[PDB]
């Protein structure tokens, strides 16, 4: 019973674009019609800050470059003239059927996978993954630079059912530990709702709206769009700044903390081979048996159930979805 | 002949590549295939400039 | 070139995934033969039921949208192909050349049958439109006119009766609704004129078409000027081999008529606004065949 | 084998009778075909006439006779000939210098022709060798010619009720008319020696202006549901009468009543003045023979233009 | 009496492109001017997560690839800032004369086929196929990813007669079983209308409009348009979505393929639900082709036997054969 | 070919120029460079009409 050369799993928990706006912390109770932050252009005089080879460089060569600097145009987004609070609004949907494979070459493999998934669900539910996801949704971990140096960050996660707000929730990213997961009644309720949606007990829609105190006329750091002079290109939708769907889903999936290093990095995004771009190192290297592909191959062909931690990581990967096999 | 060997998921993508500095392009193709680190990647050989020299899909033969 | 007693004007006929190649060396608007044969196939079915005669077909292209993408490597565009189903052997399918596009066109059907007077014109028009809707023109489905606005019915008008004043008023009324689109006509006068003009240099026909259909620049600098839009078209198919009895040609789809191997023949057509044309009958395309020579052309002789 | 037609590039499973060559030229002088060359025939080696389903057999009607099915083939000699003729033009050091001269403004004796909007077609797909007479470079390198009508490129139509386009609506400048006006205004600098040919190109260029103008109004009326009151109605009153929407259900019966008894006659004057201001002329040349023909052409064009709109209201 | 080397059947039930728009479910009934969804461009920065080929004994080599990400451009379509309901509108026509062959080499074969078709129709009508198609049209089975994760899907089929007047219907895709076919008055009426159109009533046009609740700012998934031109330079998009009139849509054939997913008699019939009616029972997603030629259930074999030997196969095989003939295609050689 | 050679501090300016009446643009460019009357000026070549043919900055190469 070999594997299928073609294997794909549709991603789950796919959110939508995140719109941004500005306003006054006082008006936080009423936040509608606020004008969006429009990107603008400003000239910046380029400078030589790169590390040049001392062997190639010389005293005259340096004075030559700084003599005629290379001008470069960039794009920046700043809050309105009078605005001290930034607002971000993005929705989230729960599709479900994570273990259900989208396409498989062999039927036996698909049946074995569905059986293993049903067995795992029966033994223990997704409540653990839902609880971990609840913390990430509650806190502002999704923000990369806007969160750093913020006075007050307030997240509001509502529940949209049949077009109405079934139940609202309000949390505090600052109060909630960034590197520590603490239990709360609201977090448990949200985790239960997510587990139900994933299990297929009903449609689940959550509208997350965050309000972060940055400062008057501050400069927000939106997602820079790919370049085709103009060097920095910001991604604007309908003349409004936003964050990429994948850019949000990457932070929202920071649930991988069982790496073999136990360093101070903290939450790591679920990615095959535990690759990290910023750190430049990939934990869970293929040499070990903890790799996702090896764990799934063993638990499928040899029916070897790995540690609960590895099983959770494998289920998280299947939920995120991707392309496997060959 | 400096040739930049790059790897990407889809034939249409931008990524840095290693400089082989090989004598001939066919030699470059063989070296790239030997150094392939992946099964689903699309090998793309490109010169020092922005002109694309050749590409090879995972399930397809070399193309120029 | 029979004089059509009446003319039926199809207000708007949409087509999807039609044939946009029309020729081995050219691509674009479908060959006029596809439209001419269509009216012929309709007359063979509805002509007996309604006792009508259709010999002239006018073509007016209101909207043409192809499916092409321009690559970044070169300035030559490419078409958007489809995905063939998996082969029976279980291996991946083989990619094949094909074309698709959205074509909104209006056809003029010349009614030469005298029996039209014995039946209501509106009923004849509705009966013809009903078959035209279910029919597939150019190789694709014909999407009827359905939208927020009211539908567009087919109007049949007799051009035999009435004074020249009424005839001109009718032609103007028709051109008023046919202005958004451009008509199609065959122009062989300029083609033969240039052929005889450059005959001294070399007797090459394809070279003349290639030179005419391009951006010509003269040394001064300057660009050569043309009176109107001129483009090559598949005037017809020339006979490449002698006629063979239905038995001689193997795998023939019919044993009633003999099979003949033919080749492709190009030409030069011109796009002129309907207001430019004086007589509408000159727009209708008439198929002419020669039993001796295998030349078969749909060019409208009355246009010259 | 040597043949002038093959089914390998046409279809992979297409198999049938391939003619060795054309013994006679059935192509008439009135048209253009492969039989008109009779030379430069290139036939490559592939790898009871029979046909196949993919032969694309099509019936043809006959006057008062039965039907004859035609099974066309794929011309290879003509295709290769046209391909080489266009390759030697687009490429080569000879044509290369010609295009460079255009940028330098040098009036080089040779003239280079361009082929915009070209299309590429691949033969054989993954296995180009399967195609007959298709070499390694010749496979998939065969480019076609664009036959799309000039109206193939369609853009949006915008007619707002503000003053931004209310004042400039009368002009309605379009990229199609902009390229024609530059060619038309270039024929006014010709001397008496060039006045012989100017009697045809300039005469035909006037009709194209009215044609491109009427198409804009037609597309506007066929895309905008209507236009309400707008500013700058002093000279724009005549333009608003070009595109007439239907009377609204909630409106009064005095809108169509006033427009019914009024004929659009100022549109011609606004168009004539617009063209006069768009195209430059010389004051001293008013008493020359060119001015007479220019006024005659403008009058002939204005007459047909006014006549076209006269039947619109009536 | 051998077979005809050339056999072709014109396809029936050929739909057109499906326009899409966004809006509020409340105004969907009273507002049909919803603006279309315009395609947009986005950039993604991902790592190479594909399976590794070289030995895993080189840790540094792996970290190197991680330093270089994969950059590409794609196309996405998202609803307007304030829009939670997606609308899709597409028409469908019924030509008829499925059994009527388009071209046949031998006349005897064509006559035998017409006789067998008339006999089958007399014995039992196409009401079974019409009923199966009615379920597909009623439910959203045609949607592949838009249906998954939907709050409420409402389909409305309008029979456009000579005039604007029509018998507009309203169904529920969620309420209707995806893997189970149940009888209903509306389904029976639709099946009867389809059977009449196929039999040659004279004119049949069905305008299907669907409204699916997805969410504010959600992303739709249109059909990617195949290009096949890799290009000789960079600065291109890796994913091109099919769009007409600056509006996203789904291919006509892509819609007609899902709508005809009635082939449930395949030999395996083990967990799989409806499958597209295609020769050799090929499946792209599953990558397997049921009804292999080795067995006698093959469409070509069954038709050859029922024509030359006049052997009437099981009612299920006859239904499948009639469905394939309705779909149309090229057979023989 | 009548070409108007103008000199200005910045590419954006409106200053008159001399009519060279040269055969090709390369001649006007070489003449402007050989006869350049200023170091920091921006050469701007234009045709008889108001259309700008090309420009060249003090520390930059010719541009069109």
Numbering used by the authors:
A (entry chain G): 25 to 252, 260 to 357
B (entry chain J), F (entry chain I): 3 to 66
C (entry chain B): 3 to 222, 239 to 322
D (entry chain A): 38 to 84, 168 to 434
E (entry chain H): 25 to 357
Tell me what the authors wrote about this structure, in their words:
We show that AcrIF9 inhibits the crRNA-guided surveillance complex (Csy) by sterically blocking the hybridization of target DNA to the crRNA guide. In order to determine the mechanism of immune suppression by AcrIF9, we co-expressed and purified the Csy with AcrIF9 and determined the structure using cryo-electron microscopy (cryo-EM) at a nominal resolution of ~3.9Å. AcrIF9 is a 7.9 kDa protein made up of a five stranded, anti-parallel beta sheet cradling an alpha helix, a fold distinct from AcrIF1.
The Cas7f subunits are each shaped like a “right-hand” and two molecules of AcrIF9 (AcrIF9.1 and AcrIF9.2) bind the “thumbs” of the Cas7.4f and Cas7.6f subunits, respectively. The two AcrIF9 binding sites are similar, and the specific residues interacting with each of the AcrIF9 molecules superimpose with an r.m.s.d. of 1.4 Å (see “Methods”). In addition, Q11 of AcrIF9 also hydrogen bonds with a nucleobase from the crRNA (C13 to AcrIF9.1 and U25 to AcrIF9.2 respectively). A second cluster of hydrogen bonding interactions is found between AcrIF9 R17 and residues S89 and S92 in the Cas7f thumb. Based on the similarity of the binding sites for AcrIF1 and AcrIF9, we predicted that AcrIF9 would sterically block target binding.
